[PDB]
């Protein structure tokens, strides 16, 4: 129980099933332990769950790499099988109920929910394979079955981790989803990159050039005259309502100049983020600026696929294992704007 | 540990060291446990201690009779040795630290406080014998050391329990105190009786007559004409400020007539109790009406020991193992008033 | 200051400005004080105010009789001048702001609310006289200004107190109201009686007979054959929805037979009370049973004033210093039902 | 929405879908509403749920009779369909999730739990008919399916309600269970009676005699000489540990003599209740005294069915729709003791 | 209500009167919403107001530019008319009551308070013009009336915004204050600049030189030999008590060197801030270092107006629409020190 | 009391015994004060102590330099005499009880605890000299008595402060510890340096070279070939478990390259810290990486004292006034690894 989980956390960094106790006060949203003559705060509840339970779930993070939470949400994963994923930005669990982790939150392994199974847990593959409605995460292709191949990054202990020769946790995942004992077989999709304004590195020569070039030079170099990059990507700050700015790399490049404030009402990994943004020289502002983190070469691809001869169209692009809708507006053979709905 | 304590409480009624776990939530001031499909509340913290600890001390409460708290307080007992005492009216523990009971609240035995030891704990006698400043409680005379002999009642699981041939927990306690490794010699002493307005039973013929007789018939039967019983005991409710009423039997008799509201600002076993009393016919009230529950015969004895000559006098009485002081005001060879301070 | 207030409450029963300090903890909704070796709870916040403030207003409560809250509410008294009134059922104060009582909740006297002043506070009369929109309460007629004369009862320290030669706080209040520096002229008025199912005493011969007589014997003794007393007063518990029962004496009589459960959603002194009532033999229930506690004679008088000709009618009655409306439904020259709205 | 729910509760007694808003504060465990110049408390959360939600489920409580909770628990009812059941003793709901009642706590109907459906909800029958694992409650036999017929009482708005010609909610429930889309065949069964020490009414001639007769006169009237009624039913309070007392009528009879303190660690409707009991003359106590409230005639029937030959035996009895086990210890052709486990 | 405000915030960035609901838990100081399968924290109360209300007020920020809060405080603005201002540093409202914004906090528009009206709200100008005691904020001069012209900056969504050709919110405000239906006409004042140690840009050539020059060169360049700039502006760190340092630009220049820790006990926009400062090389420290953010050319002006022939004088300067007092000490024709009282 | 402490804090920066009050709300974990028309947050409880008390203790920080908390912990200081030390990282007191500081937490000056006395308090030297079990902190040597000389740094108002010609608080302390009226006389020890990854400056030429050189050059320059510096100090990130990295300067140099995340479960000054570390390129990770902040020349000294001819040894080094144990593993005349247990 509680004292034992506190011991594990202090001694072994997290829950490992070791034995031993520490004294523990549970005080509103906080967990304290008596170390020597001092009471020391081990935990601070940002959950809707009883402070002692949240702390348990935390201590019982799964400490391995996995797909970013947005992907799981888009696959409609409800709950995990015999493990629990900690979202560090939120300081909470993915979901609210659990299976074979914590008695208080455990629910019977049943069963209309989309259960998420991971190959690194003992015989979860066999279990997944017997389960009507489920998701499977695997570091390796499984036979022949239809498979959503993951992107070139993954989530590990709070950080985003990029695929490469030297990585010691798995980054490239193979995802499987069965709906009524039948495997799902979606159309290939593009991926967002889970970068932020604190942690942004470019991924192509286009992105490198974008972050360093004058806007007029960049546009001219890549034949983007007709694609409204100044409104849509670079963003427009001369007006009372702040214009465009729907691609992250543009938001990143902009904030790095020091004159931007943003709030995000609904925080956490997601295919689309919405910001409440103010430019602090012009006072240009927008209450909902919807932004997406596509690789810029990828974003450009999508635009150049558009029929510019049509005034208004709902564009529908497979991303992060769903369909994302953009509005596209055009006039006189040019993009006026392009944004997420 | 927490869930093990929950298991003992549910399965065994209190803590007895049996093995087992139940799932537990700690939610602010409360403790819940999963039982079938429900979350049931098992505890309501009224302590200044962390809910999970207050619950543990509760479960570890000592299930045995003991001298009433006010005696412990008056012998200046600071803490108990290897047990803990639950006060059911307050829903708290006697004191705040503990010894050999709960790791979080245990202080080291060594210090110069008055530690209270009990014969029912193996080896506490001998420990008490090798401790300079301490209190000892026992069901039996120990050799011939100087001994305070307690009253004909004791506290058990929230109730007052009276001495008799049928009682199966001890009620007569032999109480020892040491200071500088030297026993204190008892001052012979009167005892308050720990009754209340809900649980009150007369203890002598005088007390019985008191509860049933017209006031004029009683005063004259017992020769109290010069002792202001009307004011002091019966109470005077004819004035804007409630007169007298300093003896509990008089307060009980009174309020059982249904026309009294009381408010006790500071609750708990005590030789003196202070009430904020109002009478609902006359609107007579007193913010601080000090009240002692003496055997009425004993209260009468004290008054008849006193010089009705002196106008004013602090009278010193040995009661409940301390000295208790009253003011006595007189005029023309009679008592005007008599009250504690 | 906090610890000084604690000192007054403990030593003096309430706040009277005496000097002294006690140690105090503020723990969520509670106040504790060190006393000997224990932490004793002195207060339980049931307010929307910070615990330490709610405790202060409590201690500063005015210890005197006053008109019952529903009268203050019906004269639209927003705040009190240099005193504060404790409601013991709610364990809160009347209103939310204060004047000249506690620095944290004091608003400036100047504003256009109805300030309630009291004769027992030095200089409040004259202040009331130089204030345009206000209410004045006093124990005595003031010269000959237009005056509402209160009922034969009042509130004191949580109790209802009845007028008599023995009462030592005032009960008969003379109540003044000013609007635009102009006195309002009283409408003669009936008064509800502030009784309840725990504390209920008959007030007339009719009320006594009511509580003891078979229903058929009473209806006929007082000529109520055409007034549906069975439905309206006695109550009908033969149907799935509890019929009638709109007068408190009828509800009291009923529930004292032991087969009634009530739930009052919104508690506190009020001319009308709404109950969620269930009868435990018949399972008859009504989610909203509106109830007035009129002297039964007064309720009878009103009915006998009415035209049994009209099928439906909103009847307007001056009560408790406001206008109170009832529906009266009739059929074939008799009352079907009669209730407040 | 919150303020609309507040409006229904205040104006309509509970939630019925009427339109309107009231201002509401959510303060820790409490709900307040502005009414005139005051903040009135409308709710006290005793749940593990967010205060504003607990309040909603409360307001949406189903206002109708139903089988007592312990029956639902014993049929293993996990959740209700399109209604929610309030437990007034606990001030909580039956279970923790909900279906078609509150958006925050609604889970999808699809899953393999036992969903409890009710005839009084339009279309619940047919839904129950197309659901594999479920429980059905109704006021009327449904065709001829296998049917458990409930007892002569039921729960309504906090009370126990008895069958009779005058009852205006149903009391006799016909109860169905399906597992694998297959009805379960009822085992004939005895019922506990859901009485308590505050609300207890005898149900047979034997029960009446029991409550009034000297013990020796009763034992002999009903031929119980070989059945240890003294120990088992009357209770033995002569020893340090309270002997027997396993039947509620015996506990009631006893405690109404005023010399008993009980503490129930785990509260709520249940076929077996466990008490921590103390007798205040003899100080006899038992931390875990298991108690069943059977019709006394039924308890007698069971004992007279048993072999007084065997020294020890687990006896299995169908009660409250489950199997209930007792130990029966015998010696020299008589009962020593008999208790639940 | 609450669910609708949550919807607005998620969908539209803030409250805009749109329609729709989201499920919402209110859990102590936090607001969560159910998004997909996760509970997501939308709000964290740093207010004294009920968590649901604070969140309402927030969602109902006025999202436009306005004068910094210090100016409103100095004008003694009590409350705002039909809008509410969010202080982002504090995470609270300006004030505690509201008008025409939130039912729970709304108070009648009356009325001894200094009500603050803004021209961008419909007919607030007409309202202000009819109101006895009020403040008016306007982006344009209003006729002829005496007018406090604002500084060259303003507060917008958490940031300070400087006046210029390109600004899209109003920065230059014209402020009006009536006290008894009479317009106030103060002496021209100077302004503080609302800069901090995180966000500091200079505003003159003097300030540029100050941030980059050796101290001896700067003083010599501007003839400040006799004005104690080393003590007063640069600050002195060689002594046990930390010397001078009362001008922000000096505090800024100093901290930027990396060896300064500061606490501020009473946070928020203000004409004078007080810091608890420690220099981490010398351990020089001061418990109350009072600092003011005057434009340095402005600060210098003030000093050079002083009669240096006088030992001690209370200097009185109009700033931020009040009078600020400085102590000035001189000896031998030089400033020893200059600081705020 | 509380209002006075609030006044002191606002007016004078901290508690100084001055007189005056401010209004104050105590609201859960927060303290607010009414300043003008706003409620302003003065305090946020991270303690286990009642919010009003924690705030008192804080306001009553001792505002002077002192030895880092790790040293006091290693000397087993229990409590301080007439002062209280604030740990700013934790936002808590050293310890939980107090002496002559705050009535609520004050315990009698007695007495088996190791009481800590400081020379800067009046006659604490005389008191210490009369006390059986105690610690003494002094800015100067006291006669002849055995003395632990402090390191070349100290803790002051939240920062670490280095000894030097210019320091105005004492940095070099002389520490004394008596156990039974007998002075303790330990073997000279080495010291850790209380640096962090936020605040790190080197202290020798070796440390300067370490922070700037290629690893192969540094090792070659200092003849560290046989001491496994690459594993132990620089750390190894090519493996699934993150290798070595037990010296802070190595952790510092590493994190400064931008690819490291760390959690610390048990925060606060300590001789050994444990981190939960992830390298964000390789995903190399360790759940408990134990780190020590020795001066690198000092760490090297210790290694070069080791017999490399032995496979496994518990090395025992006097540090920070205790003994710290390291594991040392060797093979083929080389260190494989060296770490704290």
mmCIF file of C-alpha atoms in Angstrom, chain E residues 29 45-48 73 77-79 90 92-96 237-240 259 261 263 265-267 274 276-285 287-288, chain F residues 9-14 25 27 30 32-42 44 58 61 63 88 156-162 164 166-169 201:
data_model
loop_
_atom_site.group_PDB
_atom_site.id
_atom_site.type_symbol
_atom_site.label_atom_id
_atom_site.label_comp_id
_atom_site.label_asym_id
_atom_site.label_seq_id
_atom_site.Cartn_x
_atom_site.Cartn_y
_atom_site.Cartn_z
ATOM 1 C CA UNK E 29 -9.476 25.303 -6.557
ATOM 2 C CA UNK E 45 -8.252 29.628 -8.609
ATOM 3 C CA UNK E 46 -5.860 32.194 -7.054
ATOM 4 C CA UNK E 47 -8.923 34.254 -5.924
ATOM 5 C CA UNK E 48 -10.965 34.466 -2.729
ATOM 6 C CA UNK E 73 -6.085 52.347 -7.904
ATOM 7 C CA UNK E 77 -11.847 53.124 -8.820
ATOM 8 C CA UNK E 78 -13.965 50.671 -6.769
ATOM 9 C CA UNK E 79 -15.776 48.647 -9.429
ATOM 10 C CA UNK E 90 -2.209 38.260 -9.822
ATOM 11 C CA UNK E 92 -7.561 37.883 -10.271
ATOM 12 C CA UNK E 93 -10.123 40.543 -11.018
ATOM 13 C CA UNK E 94 -9.585 44.236 -10.268
ATOM 14 C CA UNK E 95 -11.862 44.470 -7.194
ATOM 15 C CA UNK E 96 -14.270 41.874 -5.778
ATOM 16 C CA UNK E 237 26.593 46.717 -1.859
ATOM 17 C CA UNK E 238 29.675 46.883 0.353
ATOM 18 C CA UNK E 239 27.766 47.135 3.620
ATOM 19 C CA UNK E 240 25.733 44.895 5.791
ATOM 20 C CA UNK E 259 23.992 38.282 -8.467
ATOM 21 C CA UNK E 261 17.734 37.741 -5.341
ATOM 22 C CA UNK E 263 11.168 38.718 -2.940
ATOM 23 C CA UNK E 265 5.619 40.394 -0.380
ATOM 24 C CA UNK E 266 2.754 42.411 -1.851
ATOM 25 C CA UNK E 267 2.669 41.756 -5.620
ATOM 26 C CA UNK E 274 9.013 47.161 -2.165
ATOM 27 C CA UNK E 276 13.339 42.140 0.015
ATOM 28 C CA UNK E 277 16.788 42.135 -1.663
ATOM 29 C CA UNK E 278 19.999 40.224 -1.271
ATOM 30 C CA UNK E 279 23.221 40.731 -3.253
ATOM 31 C CA UNK E 280 24.767 37.275 -3.474
ATOM 32 C CA UNK E 281 28.479 38.253 -3.428
ATOM 33 C CA UNK E 282 28.579 40.673 -0.531
ATOM 34 C CA UNK E 283 25.552 39.345 1.240
ATOM 35 C CA UNK E 284 24.370 42.981 1.358
ATOM 36 C CA UNK E 285 20.674 42.969 2.171
ATOM 37 C CA UNK E 287 14.227 44.088 4.031
ATOM 38 C CA UNK E 288 12.289 46.932 2.388
ATOM 39 C CA UNK F 9 5.375 41.619 6.500
ATOM 40 C CA UNK F 10 3.832 44.340 4.321
ATOM 41 C CA UNK F 11 5.420 47.311 6.078
ATOM 42 C CA UNK F 12 8.794 46.049 7.205
ATOM 43 C CA UNK F 13 9.421 43.079 4.857
ATOM 44 C CA UNK F 14 9.236 40.453 7.638
ATOM 45 C CA UNK F 25 -8.480 36.219 4.928
ATOM 46 C CA UNK F 27 -8.352 30.640 2.583
ATOM 47 C CA UNK F 30 -3.507 30.808 0.961
ATOM 48 C CA UNK F 32 -4.905 37.125 1.390
ATOM 49 C CA UNK F 33 -4.919 40.729 2.603
ATOM 50 C CA UNK F 34 -7.329 43.564 1.708
ATOM 51 C CA UNK F 35 -5.238 46.258 0.085
ATOM 52 C CA UNK F 36 -7.428 49.088 -1.149
ATOM 53 C CA UNK F 37 -10.262 47.397 -3.031
ATOM 54 C CA UNK F 38 -8.305 44.227 -3.909
ATOM 55 C CA UNK F 39 -7.564 40.957 -2.068
ATOM 56 C CA UNK F 40 -3.835 40.250 -2.442
ATOM 57 C CA UNK F 41 -2.158 36.917 -1.904
ATOM 58 C CA UNK F 42 0.665 37.146 0.632
ATOM 59 C CA UNK F 44 0.973 29.912 -0.237
ATOM 60 C CA UNK F 58 7.961 32.314 7.415
ATOM 61 C CA UNK F 61 12.542 33.545 9.172
ATOM 62 C CA UNK F 63 17.303 36.716 8.156
ATOM 63 C CA UNK F 88 13.408 28.473 0.311
ATOM 64 C CA UNK F 156 21.657 33.145 3.120
ATOM 65 C CA UNK F 157 18.028 34.048 2.215
ATOM 66 C CA UNK F 158 17.761 31.269 -0.409
ATOM 67 C CA UNK F 159 21.150 31.612 -2.055
ATOM 68 C CA UNK F 160 24.538 30.039 -1.542
ATOM 69 C CA UNK F 161 27.121 32.636 -0.558
ATOM 70 C CA UNK F 162 30.898 32.138 -0.979
ATOM 71 C CA UNK F 164 35.709 36.162 0.613
ATOM 72 C CA UNK F 166 33.920 41.433 0.881
ATOM 73 C CA UNK F 167 31.224 39.310 2.513
ATOM 74 C CA UNK F 168 29.009 41.130 5.063
ATOM 75 C CA UNK F 169 27.298 38.147 6.567
ATOM 76 C CA UNK F 201 30.709 28.060 -11.054
#
